[PDB]
Amino acid sequence: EPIVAAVLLIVVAVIGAVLVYLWFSGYVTRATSQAEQLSA
Amino acid sequence: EPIVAAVLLIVVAVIGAVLVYLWFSGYVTRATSQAEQLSA
Amino acid sequence: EPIVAAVLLIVVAVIGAVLVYLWFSGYVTRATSQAEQLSAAEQLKIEAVSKTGTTVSVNVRNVGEVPVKIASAYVLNATTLTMICGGSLTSPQQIDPGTIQTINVPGTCNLIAGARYIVKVVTARGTEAAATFISP
Amino acid sequence: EPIVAAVLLIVVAVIGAVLVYLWFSGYVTRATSQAEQLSAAEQLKIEAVSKTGTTVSVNVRNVGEVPVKIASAYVLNATTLTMICGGSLTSPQQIDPGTIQTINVPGTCNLIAGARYIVKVVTARGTEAAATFISP
Amino acid sequence: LTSPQQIDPGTIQTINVPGTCNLIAGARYIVKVVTARGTEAAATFISP
Amino acid sequence: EPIVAAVLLIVVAVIGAVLVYLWFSGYVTRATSQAEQLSAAEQLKIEAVSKTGTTVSVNVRNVGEVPVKIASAYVLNATTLTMICGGSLTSPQQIDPGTIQTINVPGTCNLIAGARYIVKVVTARGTEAAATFISP
Amino acid sequence: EPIVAAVLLIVVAVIGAVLVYLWFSGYVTRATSQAEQLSAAEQLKIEAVSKTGTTVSVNVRNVGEVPVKIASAYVLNATTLTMICGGSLTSPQQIDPGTIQTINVPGTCNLIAGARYIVKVVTARGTEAAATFISP
């Protein structure tokens, strides 16, 4: 019975990691590009 | 007879997992974007 | 003489057990499968936002595999979790998987340039997606 | 006499346990494999951009090993995260691994020479890749 | 509440806390609503 | 004739089930609420310390919101977790939430100038907060 | 008359519960303590390596506090994870905590001066330690 709860928790953690990855990619691109362009 | 109790417990655990999902999505989005905008 | 009553009692117990089994199968099936379906997850993300005058326009991306309905949108104040404008949409908007739609915050609310603003959209099922932007 | 009822109850409990086992195997399999498949990550990168008149062309390279579909492109304003032009592509464009493709920002948007602009492309699955350039 | 409020599935409704209570800005508060059947839902916010 | 015995047995089973219900409700309530209340967490932090002769004075501020009692203070040697002086205070000191109080290390212990010492205070509930300083 | 059968059924259920308790205690003890014992971690580090002709000698130090047995050594090619020489040792060598031992790579493998090589040692329990060196 706790196995089902563990599976749901794992799924939730995976989805949260995916969302974190999406935001991280967007932010790193925006920040890196801003820094590189203001380096001029 | 304990099988019914186990099924109810599994349903309750699933509901709790869904609630954790909702709160976690809201928190990760809000706090993540707040940190991203303070990065400016 | 009590033997007849005992046999009848055994028959009654058999019938009761059969009825209990029937209901047990039906109920475990319905509740178990309801839990199985509700275990599913819903995914949303908003690509970009734009403001025209006093109207806020948001594009919502359906990265999931199931249809999504948008029912409400808000403009939240920073660090206080208090809404300025928002409410139920006039008609829920359906967003197909792999597609995008435009969502307008209900009503009209004035905004201050350079302020911290949180735009938030909630699904009919309750999934939450949001972001922040600097009002021009 | 209660012994018969007890044996029948044990049998019914065994039947229910078998049914629960069947559903449990099916659900753990499907949900676990769904988590495994959504666990995968996707990476994109844009090599260079070019401007012809009022049209912006972006070259996107699939650095991942899986096919990519491009669904939208934007031109974001500096430090305010507000779109100037963008929207859904007329038809999604598929990018094979190890290859390159050309993506045009939908619609027509004017630009100012020497101004700041952020070019952004989003995948069908939701992956984000972007960069900046100086408009001629 | 003066009259119980019914909320249809898939919809939203506005609920006002009965009575009048003062608050302190920047203080901690949890707002809690209970169903007729007993279900509990709540959250916190920063009072303005 | 066995029917009467069966009916009485059913009545006895029903009464037993009612008793089990009563105790089960009471116990799940008490244990559940005990777990719920012990779930709460407690915070301490010490702002600064001062030395007068051979007495160490420590200021404790509760960043938490619940009442706190300070019961002991120690002076631990570096990386060996061996106390030089300390013990239970003569009377525990209650520090109100959002306020600060002064706590003195019990007893008298000598110090060496420029040495490595750890000053430590523990709550009535067992929460630990500490810091280090250069002995003058 | 059903009362006697009920009493016997209760006695049988109690005996079954006692048996379940006995096995449950035994199982929780053995499995839980096995998990506790396998929870422990193992540390190795190789201090330096030396080459004599075509034989590689590696000094392995047990920085941990438990005995260690060395089972194999390899010379891995750079970034391709393909071994050039290696295999199971003729006899496992035991390394006491706080001590050092010398391990020779099994077999004979030629090397190229100034080329890249990864020397790797593996324990009987599976703990992995390695380093690189410049072949003379």
Automatic annotation (TrEMBL), chains C, D, F, G:
<protein>
    <recommendedName>
        <fullName>Flagellar biosynthesis protein FlaG</fullName>
    </recommendedName>
</protein>
<feature type="transmembrane region" description="Helical">
    <location>
        <begin position="4"/>
        <end position="24"/>
    </location>
</feature>
<keyword id="KW-1133">Transmembrane helix</keyword>
<keyword id="KW-0812">Transmembrane</keyword>
<dbReference type="InterPro" id="IPR013373">
    <property type="entry name" value="Flagellin/pilin_N_arc"/>
</dbReference>
<keyword id="KW-0472">Membrane</keyword>
<feature type="disulfide bond">
    <location>
        <begin position="85"/>
        <end position="109"/>
    </location>
</feature>
Automatic annotation (TrEMBL), chain E:
<protein>
    <recommendedName>
        <fullName>Flagellar biosynthesis protein FlaG</fullName>
    </recommendedName>
</protein>
